[PDB]
Design a protein around this ligand. Structure first.
Ligand code: HEM
Length: 184
């Protein structure tokens, strides 16, 4: 179960974050892991599509090769804090698993600038027991985390040394499909 009420960035610039470009997860902190894929890859695109906040997601397990895509409309709770009911889609946006109540994640942008971000998410999927996940994002795949986002990790009272890197994972990303999924 999740335990954190993440605080959104003061002065969060929604149009800059939700600009249609891709964010790569470079490092993450799961407060409730199991044995787990310590090795894992994720990226998202965040945009506005004909006046709706949207996110497209891409997950790739570099060992199992398990790959899946999602699209969500984000509903606003407050500036920088959203609730996202997701649908699993193929890369072209065709629905594989419809939106359903109880399949949602929350999404809080704790820090963002033009290149980097720190987010919190709490995923709810069926009767699954999931915990808090923090992710360091970058516009450039595998970029080393800079001092602004690392300071934000510290300011959240987290230890960056505890985050797991995705940079050494033989990750590959379908960023073109993320971009096009925004409309789906
Ligand atoms: C910004 C970040 C993230 C968001 C918003 C996110 C969102 C989601 C969503 C919506 C699902 C369910 C998709 C579906 O069933 O249609 C999912 C599943 C999953 N995610 Fe992520 N995720 C993110 C980052 C990560 C990271 C970095 C990892 C590596 C720890 C991760 C590992 C997983 C796994 C293992 C599942 C499968 C859950 C299950 O079905 O048992 N995710 N995620």
């Amino acid at each position: 179960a999740c335990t954190k009420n993440a605080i959104a960035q003061t002065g969060f610039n929604k149009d800059k974050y939700f600009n249609g470009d891709v964010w790569y997860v470079t490092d993450y902190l799961d407060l409730e892991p199991d044995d787990v894929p310590k090795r894992y890859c994720a990226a998202l695109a965040a945009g506005t599509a004909s006046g709706k906040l949207k996110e497209a997601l891409y997950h790739y397990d570099p060992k199992t090769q398990d790959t899946f895509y999602d699209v969500s409309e984000l509903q606003v709770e407050s500036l920088g804090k959203y609730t996202a009911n997701f649908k699993k889609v193929d890369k072209n946006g065709n629905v594989k698993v419809a939106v359903t109540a109880g399949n949602y994640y929350t999404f809080t942008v704790m820090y963002a600038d033009d290149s980097s971000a720190l987010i919190h998410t709490c995923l709810h999927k069926g009767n699954k027991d999931l915990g808090d996940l923090y992710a360091v994002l970058n516009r450039n795949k595998d970029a080393a985390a800079g001092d602004k986002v690392k300071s934000a990790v510290s300011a959240a009272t987290l230890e960056f040394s505890k985050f797991i890197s995705t940079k050494e994972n033989n990750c590959a990303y379908d960023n073109d499909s993320l971009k096009s999924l925004l409309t789906k």
